[PDB]
Amino acid sequence: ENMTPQDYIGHHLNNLQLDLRTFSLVDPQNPPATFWTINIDSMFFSVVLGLLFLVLFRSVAKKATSGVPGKFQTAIELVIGFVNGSVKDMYHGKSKLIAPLALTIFVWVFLMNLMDLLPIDLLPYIAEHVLGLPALRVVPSADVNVTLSMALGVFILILFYSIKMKGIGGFTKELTLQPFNHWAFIPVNLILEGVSLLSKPVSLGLRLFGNMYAGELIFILIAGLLPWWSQWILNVPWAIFHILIITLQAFIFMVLTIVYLSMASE
Amino acid sequence: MNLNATILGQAIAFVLFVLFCMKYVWPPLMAAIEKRQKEIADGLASAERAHK
Amino acid sequence: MNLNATILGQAIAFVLFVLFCMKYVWPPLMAAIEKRQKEIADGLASAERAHK
Amino acid sequence: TYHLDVVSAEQQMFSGLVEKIQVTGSEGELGIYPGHAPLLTAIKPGMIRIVKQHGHEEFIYLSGGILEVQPGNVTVLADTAIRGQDLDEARAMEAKRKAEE
Amino acid sequence: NLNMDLLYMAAAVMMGLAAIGAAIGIGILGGKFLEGAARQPDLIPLLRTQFFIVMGLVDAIPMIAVGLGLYVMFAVA
Amino acid sequence: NLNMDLLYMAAAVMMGLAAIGAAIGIGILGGKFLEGAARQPDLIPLLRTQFFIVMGLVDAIPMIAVGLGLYVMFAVA
Amino acid sequence: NLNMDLLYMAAAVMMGLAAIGAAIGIGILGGKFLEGAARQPDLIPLLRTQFFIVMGLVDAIPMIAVGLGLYVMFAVA
Amino acid sequence: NLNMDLLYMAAAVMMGLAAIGAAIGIGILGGKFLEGAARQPDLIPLLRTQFFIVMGLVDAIPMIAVGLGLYVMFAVA
Amino acid sequence: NLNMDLLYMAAAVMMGLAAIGAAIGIGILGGKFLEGAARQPDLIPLLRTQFFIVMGLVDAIPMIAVGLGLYVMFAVA
Amino acid sequence: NLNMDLLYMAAAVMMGLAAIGAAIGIGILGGKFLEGAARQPDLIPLLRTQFFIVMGLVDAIPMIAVGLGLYVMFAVA
């Protein structure tokens, strides 16, 4: 097996893009060129982790009792109180959407990041040898397409709430008039308030991808370069650090979604 | 990296996990919690009424 | 380079990570769940005092 | 040089002209010298120590107080005790029961 | 060929300078928020509002600068 | 080749230095707003009205630099 | 030469300036946390959650240049 | 005729360094006005007068570099 | 061919700048710990726990840059 | 020939910026030690202990930079 380390690090950074036209499992030696080549690995792992979220919480929500709770049911209501207490801090309106939106974003983006902890060759090896797929990488949030899909999803929510809760009359005042007030400044203000609105979600998704990509790539580099006897002394101090990043990047995507949807209407 | 059709696919999965979570997961859990919190208040009231 | 060697070094580095997680990350969690089942019991006992 | 007072609501403790003092400030130990810019602090329990004119050495223990400085003047408004115990609220507790009994 | 290959160096300059400007500018502004939050802690949801007012002004210029850097790489080059 | 290349570089230095100026200059000014906000919170609607005047001058000069940066990329090419 | 070596020089400029901006901006902000946490040591859970609000905004804009810097080396060069 | 290409670069560095100096100078100077307004708010139209007397001097040298750099870009180039 | 000398320069810029940001940001942050440890010396076990929480964030983006500078010199060059 | 010569310029920028990072960062951290020792002179053997705990983190990065600057200058040369 002619793995040079510069090539081993190469093949790991290739996702399972597949063309709708050919329906063919592409491989890293030659990348085809079209938009329509879904990254198979990301969709499958994203919905399997998303199903595991909903299957766990429903298996408790369908039974959860107001007695002394069981030791599993108590771990679910701790996350429910953490999510509701953070909503209740930063949102006062009546909307039934914000609380469950904030939950699914926290628990799903947490599960997506958690994949980066697993040994970098474990699932990719099994997929090539056992199955025969040309490639795999198993962290969904270490790819842009999922994180911009969530961040543009929240942007459509940001526009729905600012139209709904204050109307086109109010939304047209705030976009033109602020921050300089006088109608003399309107032409400049339309650039500043328009891009600042887009700056909020673009920072959400690219913060999450930027962390996750540059944490998966560190495990690919430490695996690719260092000899086996020596990997653990640079791998173990990094996995211990990235447990902190996987939580904080799930907590911040939750928090800023609430803050943006909350400060949109009120 | 590369922008891709995955951006639409993830947007279907995202909306549908929010809709089943909104109906099924969240209302039955928060009814069950608030039903406990309410009873604690009922116990406190009973202690006040007893003394009076 | 040897590929199976990379999997060997990843195993050693995972084992040492698990052993840190077990001694510094998990007990703070089983502390928290246990101390939120302590609180509930005290409040339920307080309700019995209200009942008396 | 400057004119030091040490006083309490009960009494004058000292008055006289002074070449320097060392005095135990709220955030740390302090020395005051002639013409030192105006200054305000609480003072900790402990010694203030003084040299009078001709550098004659004098030590006073203080339970506490407030120090302040003005051009030509230092005054220490000392008090009898910390007062921060506030255990004398208990002394008001029998003021009630003895009225009810 | 050097025409496009230098443009990646043009966007690197433009959005790198924006990254030092915006991160230090919010770091100063955010520091006066947390010290305001410790002097008047009953007050945080007032001041945080104000922090989000003025942080909307701080980032607007760096975020067009980053956006125009991204445009040079993906569009032009 | 390298005439069109260098115009984009000339816009990168122009918008990069302007993004440092506009970001840092509001960081300092908006932190002094926040500390007068924390000291006298009922007075915020008055200082905010002074913050928007002063802040308009700070960006006024960086924003003719940004306007010439977009001119050099889009219009001269 | 000129294709590959400049793309590493572009990534060096992008992820070096983001190292300046995101480190110093969180040094400035993180010192006001530790000063507030020495003034009001019952507040630290309240101030650290405010610190996590503010630190998210500081790091976001450098993290654009960190992820795109890694794109230029690995995807482009 | 290569001469045109550097003159856009020579106008770019005058207007970028002017935008740094004229934005951070008015940010330091205006931020001490706002603490002066938070202390003594019945004084504000007295302090605005001194702020505009002093802010004209911060902008003496930068409005000349914006002045001559905007010349070089159009008249000479 | 000559190309391999720019790869060391690219790592030098990337790794030195990350040593500016990782050293000063810990110095700012660490001195504010010492100032509060001087004040409340019975709280040295608590503040020293917070310092490691916030210090973990300061050096994060510097750690990526130092890791990519080692990759460039040894692995690529 | 430039494959010898640039490597001394590539090491000079590594051991310049490592020297600005380690000297300013210890000066800020060491000066806060010196005030706390002047205020709290009973505590010096305490603060000196925590100064040496905190000082070894400031130097972790600048000694990567200077050790690679020595390696680049002499080993690869």
Author numbering:
A (entry chain a): 4 to 269
B (entry chain X), C (entry chain Y): 1 to 52
D (entry chain H): 3 to 103
E (entry chain I), F (entry chain Q), G (entry chain P), H (entry chain L), I (entry chain O), J (entry chain N): 3 to 79
Provide the authors' original text about this structure.
The enzyme is based on two rotary motors, termed F1 and Fo, that are coupled together by two stalks: a central rotor stalk and a peripheral stator stalk. The central stalk is comprised of subunits ε and γ and rotates during the enzyme’s catalytic cycle. E. coli and other related bacteria exploit an internal subunit, termed ε, that can sense the environment and inhibit the enzyme under certain conditions.
Here we present cryo-EM data showing E. coli F1Fo ATP synthase in different rotational and inhibited sub-states, observed following incubation with 10 mM MgATP. Masked 3D classification focusing on the central rotor highlighted sub-states in which the εCTD adopted either a condensed down conformation or an extended half-up conformation. In the half up sub-states, no density for εCTH2 was observed, however εCTH1 remained attached to subunit γ. The sub-states of State 2 showed the best detail for the two εCTD conformations and allowed the c subunits to be assigned to Fo rotational sub-states based on their interaction with the εNTD, assuming that the c-ring remains bound during rotation, which is likely because the interface between the ring and central rotor has a buried surface of ~1200 Å230. When aligned on the stator a subunit, the Fo ring rotates the equivalent of two c subunits in a clockwise direction when viewed from the membrane (akin to the synthesis direction). This rotation of the Fo motor was facilitated mainly by a twisting of the central stalk (~50°), but also by flexing of the peripheral stalk (~15°), with the remainder facilitated by small rearrangements within the complex. The twisting of the central stalk involves the εNTD rotating about the γ subunit and this is mediated by a ~10° bending at the foot of the N-terminal γ subunit helix (defined by residues γ39-57). When the εCTD is half-up, εCTH1 provides an additional link between the εNTD and subunit γ, stabilizing the conformation of the central stalk together.
